[PDB]
Structures are given as C-alpha cells and as structure tokens.
C-alpha cells in the first residue's frame, strides 16, 4: 500500500506503486517523513515535490499518503502563536529540540494537544437538524477574547445524536456525533481546511463602515473603509513600522494577522522582539497585543513552497476568524517577495516565461487573492456578521514601478498611501506625500458622514484645494517672490504652512497626539477652515493683513495649541471647549475688524 | 555530558565498502554506472583509473538501478573496461576540531600547510539546518574594522551582512586582506576569530595572502580555505559551505565572536551556472539558473546573533559587477538579501585614493543599533550625518565652480570646496598598514569639521557642538 | 519616438540621459545667478 | 569559385570574381539544417556558418608556382541596416575590411553613397608608398579621415547646442565636411579619375586649413606640397 522511490533529482522525486492518489495529495516521503505533494501522475509513477533538502535519500524508501491537499488546522489556541509559512509552531519546536535549528523531518501538532479547554454547550439538543457553519458552543480563550465560537465545518449536515455537556476537554475528545447516511461523523474542538479553496459564505456585502486608524491625515483625507483593500510602498527609510504599529494598537478591529512573507531575517527578529512589548489600554492596560494576534514568520532560508503559501495561509486564517462574526485585518509585508517565490517555483518547474520573465498566473492569482477579501454575513444559523481588510505592502525591484507586480497591485487595490523618504529627514513623521496618495472610498463614506458628520466631506475637500493652491502658489513665489502676491495669496500660503505643521505632522509619542479619535479631528479641521475663511473674508472688505496678523497672532497660537489639547478627557467636554474656542476666534475677528 | 555514549554508539561500528567495475558509458564531465545496488543521492565515490590514479566524484541522479557520477578532476583517461568505482555510503562530511586556527585548508578541506592531519573532534554535514527565526535577536554592539571610511561612516554591528561591491580591476583583495588583518572588537582578545575563504583566485593572489598572513601574525586567528582558479568547479561551490559550517560550529559551540569573509561571489555564480548544464535545466535570466535565489539565501542567511548562546557571527561577501552595472542579477539579489552595501569607485582609484571608496552610494541599515554610549562615543551618529551632507554639498560645489567661476560662489561654497579636497586627501586616504581606532578617526573628523564656523554646523546637536568643538 | 537603433546601444542612451540632467541643473543655476544680478543692475540704473 | 580557381591557377591569367547577395545564400543555408533539428546558433542560424563562409571566402590570393591572380568582391545585404547582424559580423571577421554604403548619403542624393567612417582596407598600407604611388598617399588619407570625424562630431554636438559654443575648429570643420561630401565623394557614373587627380583634389580641399593644425601629416610632405 506504500510507495517505493524510483528516481531522485534535486528537489524532484518519482514514486512507484502509487495508484489512487489525487493530483495534490500530500506524501510523507523518506524514512524521516519529509513532506511533499504530488504534481504529475503518469500511470503508476507520480512526480513529487519536496520541501526540505533531499540529500542522502536512497531508492526503495517507503512513501505514504496523507489524504488531503495542503491544509491548515483551525481551532482554539491560534492567538499568541508564531507560525511558519506552512502552519508550523516555532516556539514548541525550539523547546522540543532544545537546538537553534529546524531539524529536517520534524512533525508536531499545529495546535497544542495537551492544554485543557473549558467548553460550554451552545443552543442545540439531540435530535435537532443541523447544517454546516452553525455555532454549537463557545470556549473562553483569553480575557481579551472570551467568545471563541465553535463551528460545524462546511460540507457537513445531518442530525446530532450525542453532544458532550459542559466541562473541560482537550483537542482529542469527540464532543459531537452527527448522524447521516453513515453515522461515522465525529467532531472535536478543531478541524482543517484546504488553503487554496476560499471558504464558503452566505453572501458578500458592500463595505461602507470606515476603518479608523487613529492617525489624523489617514482618516482625514485618505480613508479606508472597513472591509476593503489598500496598498503602501515598501521602502527602507520610509519607516512603515509606525503605520503597522498604530494600526495594531489603535484600530477598531478585533483580530490582527501579521504575515512576514520573506524578509532579511534580522527584521523578523526585530519585529518579533518588539510586538510582545506593545501594550493596549482599553478598560485597563490589557498588557499584550499577542493576545490579539497570530504572526506568520518566513525568513529567506525557509523552503520555497512554504515561503510562497504564506499569504494563502494568512488569508485563510483571517477568513476563519471573520466567519465567527468578528472583524479582522490582514497585513502582508512584501508581496514582491511572494511574487519572487512564485516565479522561482515556476522556473524550477521549467515553464514558459512571460512579461519580464514572470509566469502568466500573476494577474489571475492576485485578482482572486484580493477578491477573497471583503465583507459578508457568515454562513450559519445565528446570522452573525464579520469583515476582512487586507493591507498589502509592495516593494519595488530597485525603486522603479514598471514591474508587473506593482502595476497589477495598483490596478487591483483602491487606496494608496504614498510614503516619501525626503520627509523623514525633515521629520514629517507621518511621511505621506499628499500629492500622490489617494483614496476611492469617499463616495460610500459620505453615506456615513451625513449620518454622523455631515460637513466632513466639504471640509476635507476644502483643505485638498487649499493645499493644491498653496503648493502651486509657491512655484511662482520662487519666480517673482512674495512681493508681487496679494494678501489673499499670502494668507493661503501661511495657512497652508500652519496646516502642514499642525494638522499633518504628528509626534505619535506624546500622551495627547498618540491617538487622535474622529470627533477631535472633526473639530480640528472645522476650526482651521473657519479661521482661514474668516480671515480672508475680513481682508476682503478691506484691511491690511499684516495688522490683522499682528492682532490675531494670539488666535493663531491658540488654534495651533488646540492640537496639543489632551483627548480622552470628556469626549464631549472637548467639544464644548472647541465650541468656546471657535466663538472666541469669531468674536476676536469681529472686534479686530473694528 | 552523555555525548560520549552517542559518540561510541555510532563510533565503533565498521562497515564494509562495495566496489564496482560496471562503467557503462560517459558524457563529458559525467560518468554512468549501470548495476548499482540501493544507490544514495549525493554520495561520495572514489574512482580508480586503469593507470592506478585516483579521483573523486559525487552522484547527481538515480534512475531504477543507475547512478550518474561527475568527476572533480575532469574525466580524461578513464575507460569502460578497467576502471573500478568504490562507493562511500554517506554524504560529504567535514572534520571539525577546535584547533583549525592557524592551519590552511584546500578547497575540499585537505590541509596544505605541510602539517599533520586534522585529528577531528567531530564530523558534521556541510549544509546544516536553517536557524529557527524565533530564536534570533538583533545586532547590538559594533565591530572595529580599522578602516577610516568604513568604521566612521559604515560601522558594522555584529550579526550584520554587508557586501562590498567592486569592479573587475580594483584592489578589493588588498582591502579584504587589510580588513582581516586589522579586525577586532572595541574596548571603551580571547573572543575573536576569523574565517577567510577564497574561491577562484589567481596563484599570485593566493601566494600573497599566505605570505602576508604568515609574517603578520594574524594566521593563528584565522583558518583559510584557498581554492585556485584551475581547480574543479564543484570544489568551488563546496568551499563556502565548508567555511560557513566551521565558522558556525565555532561561534555556536564555543561562544566566539567570529567574522567570515568570502572575497568573491561572481566566480561562485559561474561555478553554479556550470552545474545544471551537466543536468538539462534550461538557462534562466542572463543564462544564470533561475533558482539561484534559494541557494544564495542558504549561503547568506546562516548569520546573526542567537538567543541563548553568547556567540555571534558576521559576513562580508565581496561581489564583482561584470560591467559596473547594478542591474545585473547577482548584485540585485545580494542587495535584496543583505543589508546595505559598500561601493568602490573607479575614478577615485584612478586618482590614487586608497582605499578608493565613495561614500555617497554607501549605506549601512543597522548603524542605528551599532553606535551609542558605552558601545562607543556619543557623537558618532551626528558627525556621520554632518560629514555625509557636507561631502554631498562639496561635490556639486566643485561641479558649479567651473561654470560660474569662484567669486560668485557663496562663502559656504568656498568652504565646502576646500573641505572636499581636504577630506579626500587626508581622511579617506589611509596607508596600507595604517591602523586607526574609532576614537582617532572621530578626532580626525572633528579636525576636518573645524573648518566651518561653529554656528553653521546645523545638523549637529548644540550639546555635542558645545562639548567637543573646543580646541 | 525616435530613430530606433536597437543594437545594444543602452549605454550610449544612458550617458545621454546623464549629460542632459547635468546640463539642465547647471544651466538652471546659472540662470538663477544671472537673474539675481540682473535685479540689482535694474535698481541701480533706475536710481 | 571552382571555375575561377581553374582559370587562375591552370591558365595563368588574372581573374576578378563578383558574386552577389550572400544574404540569400545564408538564408538558404539556414532553411536547410532547419528541416533537421541541429542545435541552432545565434538568431537561429547554424553554428557552422562560420566554417562554411570561411570555406567559401578563402579561395583567393596568389601562389608563387603560378603567376595568375584571383580577387573576390562579394556583395552583402544587412537586413535592418545594422552591422551587428551575424552575417555581416562574420563576413567582417573573415575578410580584410569592407566598403560600407549608407542610407543618409543616398537620401541626400550623393553618388556613390559610400560612408568612409566605418570602412577600411587592411592591405592598403602595404600596397601604397613611394615608387608604387605618390608618397603622400599614406598620410593624406589619415588626415582626411581625422578631419571627417572631427567635422561629423562637431556637427552632431552643434545640432543641440548651436553655433555659439563653437570654436574656430568647429566652424572650419563644418564647412570642410560640407565641401568634402559635396565635391570629393560625389562623381558621375561614367566619370573616372586616376589616383593623382584625386590626390590633387584632396590637397585642394585640405588647403583650406592653416598649415599648423595638420599635425597628423609629416612635416616634410606638408612643406613640400602644401606650399603651392
């Protein structure tokens, strides 16, 4: 029933006596049980792909069959875990081996098989008809998340003849007996799923609810809807780590799945050392972020197939967590590396190249992968709802954006947050080049603004035109100097500078400017536009703007200092203070005109 | 301590060795046995030609009862009637002992210092398993190269991987020799060691390396793996694996801060293209095999500090761009895998500047973790930026001098013009045997900075300006 | 958008690009300086 | 070639063969060996085309035993007006220099539209000289080539900058190039000139320049001839 090796060639192996094997089964080739997958079947012999190094193999070694394609186990215990590209626990492996290597031919359960979990029955009873995707019990996973639900895997129906009652169990105790034509069906606290097949869902919806990150510029001018895609350039000096950290700590999501898809290694060490120290404070300083995140690490040494399947694994995990009714936020690291791995695999298979040497799959693969994102209502009885929002990170070949990867990604995604290094030295620490970055979810977000903040769109637009006008104005200012410019032009210029240095720039470490909520930013841009338009109106009827600036230097300083105002104090008393400041500015301008 | 039980268990067990006489065809650098029994991929074999000469090889493929051996030292003189092929029964292994230091090894690891055998303390598989990422940490402290233009502006934190790009006809080898000779830690040594493996080099360069390392005493801190140009290519691809394996053993089983150098990778790329042409894998981009990314990653990414052990490791691969273009695949991949790069300009070399390094394109991403207090003085990070900015300004000022005279230039422009020449002629220009500590280089940089008025050095913090600008 | 010499002439065109950039920057700065000195001549001749 | 060899080496009479359009021959050679599946060479042509063309060309020269001569003047056809194509590349590798023909000159209505800049004849230095020809033949050619190159580069640079950045050398070179192209190269189909007349025309053209910038010419010949 086993298979004897018949040939070997680097990473290529040919089995024998293989009858009754699918085209993508998994096989435990070798005495050490190296993992592999069948590719081509020709009668009895079948080509096999290996992951580890094949040195030392010998003809006649038995070959086994797993019985499924590449799959990932899902269940309680994912949180606080650090995984390889192919669902391999690294902490447990290191502890078990006591070495500092990944000893080839090592197999340990993806999830711990010893920790006892306290299960609580759901809402069904014996003899009740059931359908796939229906919740039938919860589990307390952490103080942060305590409602880790238990589903019935899709493609499974029937009636339940026995359900275990409350108690404490491990992951190897059948807690349900679904009866069908064959009553063989048993179920435990976990199950598996092929990675390459998208999870079934009742129906997709239209994402409209905004995703707020806590930054000012992001949600002010280039918002991302909670459920959509986005892209940000990958550079060394840009310092994207700030964006990822802020998204992890201050966003309104409920589960983060960071994916390292091939890095220099040392960067992986840095991020792994850093994450367990980031702290969030909601209803008290809930110490870790690891209690809300699972991380997939893939250094360059990792096997090519593992380095390639990383994003598929991550997105599958995200979809699983979405179907529980929670909100998820995937974050890739370098899609360029994933494309590199895909091209390397294609080349090793010896297939026809395409544009710039890449294969022909890239377009379709990326399109499908991105389409896997979105917002939908889960598949089950309770009718919960979730959402997924991928955040890609494209790195170029050598800076140029002519590569197919960048073109396809930009064509697919909807939001781009351009980062510039030049701002780094000037320390606009949120280093967003406002002349390039853009968003396309405004048309939907207006249907939320009107319900909550009707004036937001006109204000954000107004500052968009203000910034464009100021940057254009400076061009001719250099040519002819400010001398030949009217007072209105100088007003535009200086208000643009004030906005640049207050509204956009953000320390990110001060207790007050670390995390700016929505209403606070609402008040800020309202106040800034009011100041500018009131000043220009006052100048319109006739007045030397120099004298006006001399009179209202205090008002300008007050509006600037309003940014230093500490939020998290009343969250409506702040609104009262902002109203007081606005009225004070109005009456000060009125008196100044006199 | 129980390692003795394992050593004896697999130690005192002799096994026989087959011997074949069924050579049944040959194709260039290959050889095709016919009726092997239970072959084993990637074995080691010892051919015996009819004249009594002896060679070696390593299988590549196995059909049903067949092997395809490739011989290291060519294939001329073999025959299909009298040659006898002897199998080994286990892959290539290296003899490892603490006392490599001082000795010189050939490409395959046979000592060539007219000394006794290694007296191995153990045996190992050359290409070990990858490091577990979860058990890895960040660089922290600095390594003292002794070169002014490197340490001051491109410090190397232990655990980094900084390649040194260079052109064909440049003195990169001399720079590498000087670096290996002057390396060491910083004391604001009983823990330092170097591995210096050279692949694909002339005879003169090898002799110069040996003679210089002999009479300069550095030999007993190093262990060279020389491989001349006329030696088999397979041995060439093998050599870096041996060097990395021995360095890893030392670092992570004796807790020694070690530094490794390679002195070339283009010739490694050539040796690699040669393989997969013996096989029928069609050529990739620019003729190179497509899958070089994986194996180059394997070579490089056995570096960095480790969680538990106190040891460490560092790499300085040396490339050679064919026609001085970064677009070539080799430098592209190396930059992709490694952190920052060190350039070597041709023009500076033409002007007699040694080491002919240009700093404008240079970069080291882990600097920020290298400099600091205790680990070094407090003013390194500011002087670095200041000097970089002023050099950049001086270049363009010299450019404009020819078009707009000299008087129209601002006072800033004249000062920068003078500073550029002074910097080039004094700071970077370092004697072949002039060794400088980081402190001395910092002092010289301060001396050069003293050209400008105190106020104007904007990029430097006022605290440092007040503290050190005096005198 | 030119006469198309396709015979591995990349280096020549890259050299032309670099020369164009250098000349552009140099002439820009020369014009800046000349205009700056033109302003003062205008003022002084007027007075 | 066999007929030419017979006539030249077994009848003692000088010969001059003119075989046309080697491009068609090479194309036909490619067609064969494509019905086969031999390892194709650069741009699909057979690898052994070098040896084939060497076989074709080498039948030429002279032998001491006889006193007849054989001279080859093959005609080529570059596909896309590019000299890097394998056919012309190998032909240049084999033969002793070649005479180029340019599209630009023909466009400007100049006959014979020969471009001297990329052309050469390796045996010229051995054939020319005193006794055989006028002594100035071996250096006036070099001087004219240098001046032509200077004029061409000066015009190319001026095309983007203009006259303002031109010294005396560029101004002289442009006009000299114009006169040379429009008077020396051009000649009627049935018009012919001996070597001496062409030399005199060359000196007339060169006399434009002052006596001191003709550095590439030896002082003796310059003094002897440029005087009058």
């Amino acid at each position: 029933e086993y298979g004897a090796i018949y040939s070997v060639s680097g990473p290529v192996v040919i089995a024998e006596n293989m009858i009754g094997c699918a085209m993508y089964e998994l096989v435990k080739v070798g005495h050490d049980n190296l993992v592999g997958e069948v590719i081509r079947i020709d009668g009895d012999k079948a080509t096999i792909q290996v992951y580890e190094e094949t040195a030392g193999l010998t003809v006649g070694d038995p070959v086994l069959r797993t019985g499924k394609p590449l799959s990932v186990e899902l269940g309680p215990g994912l949180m606080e875990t650090i995984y390889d590209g192919i669902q391999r626990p690294l902490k447990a492996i290191k502890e078990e081996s006591q070495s500092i290597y990944i000893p080839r031919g090592i197999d340990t359960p993806a999830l711990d098989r010893t920790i006892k979990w306290q299960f609580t029955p759901g809402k069904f009873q014996v003899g009740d008809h059931i359908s796939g995707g229906d919740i039938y019990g919860s589990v307390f996973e952490n103080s942060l998340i305590s409602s880790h639900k238990i589903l019935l895997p899709p493609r499974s129906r029937g009636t339940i003849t026995w359900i275990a009652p409350a108690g404490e169990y491990t992951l190897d105790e059948k807690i349900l007996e679904v009866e069908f034509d064959g009553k063989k069906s048993d179920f435990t606290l976990y199950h598996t799923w092929p990675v390459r097949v998208p999870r079934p869902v009742t129906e997709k919806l239209s994402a409209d609810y905004p995703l707020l990150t806590g930054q000012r510029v992001l949600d002010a001018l280039f918002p991302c809807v909670q459920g959509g895609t986005t892209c940000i350039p990958g550079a060394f000096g840009c310092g994207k780590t700030v964006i990822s950290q802020s998204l992890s700590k201050y966003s309104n999501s409920d589960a983060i799945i960071y994916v390292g898809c091939g890095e220099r290694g040392n960067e992986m060490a840095e991020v792994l050392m850093e994450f367990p120290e980031l702290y969030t404070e909601m209803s008290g300083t809930k110490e870790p972020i690891m209690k809300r995140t699972t991380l997939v690490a893939n250094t360059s040494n990792m096997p090519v197939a593992a380095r390639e399947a990383s994003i598929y694994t991550g997105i599958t995990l995200a979809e699983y967590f979405r179907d529980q009714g929670k909100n998820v936020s995937m974050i890739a690291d370098s899609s360029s590396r994933w494309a590199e791995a895909l091209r390397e695999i294609s080349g090793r298979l010896g297939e026809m190249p395409a544009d710039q040497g890449f294969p022909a799959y890239l377009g379709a693969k990326l399109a499908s992968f991105y389409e896997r994102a979105g917002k939908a209502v889960a598949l089950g009885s309770p009718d919960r709802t979730g959402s997924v929002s991928i955040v890609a990170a494209v790195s170029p070949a050598g800076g140029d954006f002519s590569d197919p990867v960048t073109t396809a990604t930009l064509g697919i995604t909807q939001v781009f947050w351009g980062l510039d290094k030049k701002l780094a030295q000037r320390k606009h620490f949120p280093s967003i080049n406002t002349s390039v970055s853009y968003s396309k979810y405004t048309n939907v977000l207006n249907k939320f603004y009107d319900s909550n903040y009707p004036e937001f769109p006109v204000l954000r637009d107004r500052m968009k035109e203000i910034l464009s006008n100021a940057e254009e104005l400076e061009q001719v200012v250099q040519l002819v100097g400010k001398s030949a410019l009217s007072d209105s032009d100088k007003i535009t210029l200086d208000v643009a500078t004030l906005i640049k240095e207050d509204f956009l720039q953000q320390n990110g470490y001060s207790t007050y400017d670390a995390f700016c909520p929505i209403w606070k930013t609402f008040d800020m841009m309202r106040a800034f536009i009011s100041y500018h338009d009131e000043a220009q109106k006052a100048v319109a009827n006739g007045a030397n703007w120099s004298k006006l600036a001399d009179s209202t230097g205090d008002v300008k300083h007050a509006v600037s200092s309003s940014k230093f105002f500490e939020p998290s104090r009343g969250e409506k008393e702040v609104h009262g203070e902002f109203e007081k400041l606005l009225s004070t500015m109005q009456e000060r301008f009125a008196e100044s005109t006199d | 301590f129980a390692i003795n039980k394992k050593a004896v268990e697999q130690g005192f067990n002799v096994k026989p060795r087959l011997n074949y006489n069924t050579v049944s065809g040959v194709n260039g650098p290959l050889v095709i046995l016919e009726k092997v029994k239970f072959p084993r991929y990637n074995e080691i074999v010892n051919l015996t030609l009819p004249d009594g000469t002896v060679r070696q090889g390593q299988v590549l493929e196995i059909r049903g009862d067949r092997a395809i051996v490739q011989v290291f030292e060519g294939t001329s003189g073999i025959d299909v009637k009298k040659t006898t092929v002897e199998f080994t029964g286990e892959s290539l292994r290296i003899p490892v002992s603490e006392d490599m230091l001082g000795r010189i090894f050939d490409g395959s690891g046979r000592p060539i210092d007219n000394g006794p055998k290694v007296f191995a303390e153990d045996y190992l598989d050359i290409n070990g398993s990858p490091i577990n990422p979860y058990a890895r940490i960040y660089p922290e402290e600095m390594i003292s190269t002794g070169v002014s233009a490197i340490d001051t502006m491109n410090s190397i934190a232990r655990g980094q991987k900084i390649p040194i790009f260079s052109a064909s006809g440049l003195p990169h080898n001399e720079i590498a020799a000087q670096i290996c000779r002057q390396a060491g830690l910083v004391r604001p040594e009983e823990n330092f060691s170097i591995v210096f493996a050279a692949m694909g080099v002339n005879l003169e360069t090898a002799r110069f390396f040996k003679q210089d390392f002999e009479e300069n005493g550095s030999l007993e801190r190093t262990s060279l793996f020389l491989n001349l140009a006329n030696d088999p290519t397979i041995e060439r691809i093998i050599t870096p694996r041996l060097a990395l394996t021995t360095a890893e053993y030392l670092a992570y089983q004796t807790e020694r801060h070690v530094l490794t150098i390679l002195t070339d990778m283009s010739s490694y790329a050539d040796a690699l293209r040669e393989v997969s042409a013996a096989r029928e894998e069609v050529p990739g981009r620019r003729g190179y095999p497509g899958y070089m990314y994986t194996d180059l990653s394997t070579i490089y990414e056995r570096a960095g500090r480790v969680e538990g052990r106190n040891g460490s490791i560092t790499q300085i691969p040396i490339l050679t761009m064919p026609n001085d273009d970064i677009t070539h695949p080799i430098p592209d991949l190396t930059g992709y895998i490694t952190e920052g790069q060190i350039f070597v300009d041709r023009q500076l070399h033409n002007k007699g500047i040694y080491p002919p390094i240009n700093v404008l394109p240079s970069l080291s991403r882990l600097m920020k973790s290298a400099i600091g207090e205790g680990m070094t003085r407090k003013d390194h990070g500011d002087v670095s930026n200041q000097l970089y900015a002023k050099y950049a300004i001086g270049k363009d000022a010299a450019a404009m001098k020819a078009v707009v005279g000299e008087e129209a230039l601002s006072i800033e422009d004249k000062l920068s013009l003078e500073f550029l020449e002074k910097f080039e002629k004094t700071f970077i220009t370092q004697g072949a045997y002039e060794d400088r500590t980081v402190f001395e280089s910092l002092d010289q940089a301060w001396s050069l900075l003293r050209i400008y008025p105190k106020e104007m050095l904007n990029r430097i913090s006022p605290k440092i300006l007040d503290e050190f600008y005096d005198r | 958008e030119q006469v198309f010499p396709t015979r591995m002439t990349l280096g020549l065109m890259k050299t032309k690009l670099k020369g164009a950039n250098q000349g552009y920057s140099l002439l820009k700065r020369k014009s800046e300086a000349l205009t700056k000195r033109f302003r003062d001549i205008t003022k002084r001749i007027d007075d």
Side-chain angles (χ1 to χ4, degrees), chain A residues 411-447:
Chain A
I412 291 174
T413 189
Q414 296 309 85
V415 177
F416 184 80
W417 293 333
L419 301 200
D420 178 358
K421 185 260 163 188
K422 269 74 77 185
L423 301 160
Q425 46 269 48
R426 293 181 271 175
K427 297 158 291 195
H428 308 60
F429 278 113
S431 171
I432 289 164
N433 176 353
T434 74
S435 67
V436 176
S437 82
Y438 72 100
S439 178
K440 279 164 179 156
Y441 288 110
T442 69
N443 301 336
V444 188
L445 289 184
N446 55 37
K447 181 261 281 179

Side-chain angles (χ1 to χ4, degrees), chain B residues 216-262:
Chain B
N216 295 171
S218 69
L219 181 53
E220 65 89 21
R221 291 186 293 112
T222 77
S223 303
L224 274 67
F225 300 97
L226 271 60
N227 165 26
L228 287 74
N230 55 304
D231 285 2
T233 70
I234 179 162
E235 188 151 359
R236 196 180 304 177
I237 66 159
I238 286 165
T239 290
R241 264 66 170 282
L242 306 182
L244 279 174
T245 293
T246 180
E248 162 172 316
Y249 159 80
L250 289 183
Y252 305 160
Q253 310 183 32
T254 46
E255 306 182 75
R256 288 193 168 179
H257 304 266
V258 69
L259 161 62
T260 75
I261 305 162
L262 307 184

Side-chain angles (χ1 to χ4, degrees), chain A residues 8-9 58 101-102 264 344 397, chain B residues 39 41 61 129 248 290 301 336:
Chain A
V8 180
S9 310
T58 183
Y101 303 161
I102 296 180
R264 283 88 185 287
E344 286 302 337
Chain B
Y41 179 23
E61 297 302 330
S129 178
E248 162 172 316
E301 281 288 3
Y336 281 159

Side-chain angles (χ1 to χ4, degrees), chain B residues 335-386:
Chain B
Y336 281 159
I337 290 173
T338 52
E339 283 82 318
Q341 60 278 9
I342 310 298
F343 269 89
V344 173
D345 185 75
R346 181 177 297 281
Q347 312 161 26
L348 302 167
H349 167 47
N350 299 119
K351 292 182 286 300
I353 316 311
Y354 192 115
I357 309 186
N358 69 342
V359 292
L360 297 166
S362 296
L363 179 61
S364 171
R365 308 156 82 107
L366 306 192
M367 181 145 298
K368 192 57 55 173
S369 172
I371 58 165
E373 285 61 11
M375 41 175 68
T376 175
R377 213 150 69 187
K378 49 172 68 175
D379 47 351
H380 201 132
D382 317 312
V383 300
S384 174
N385 307 131
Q386 196 54 73

Side-chain angles (χ1 to χ4, degrees), chain A residues 487 538-539 542-550:
Chain A
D487 265 355
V539 165
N544 171 13
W545 178 52
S546 298
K547 300 167 73 182
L548 305 198
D550 310 328

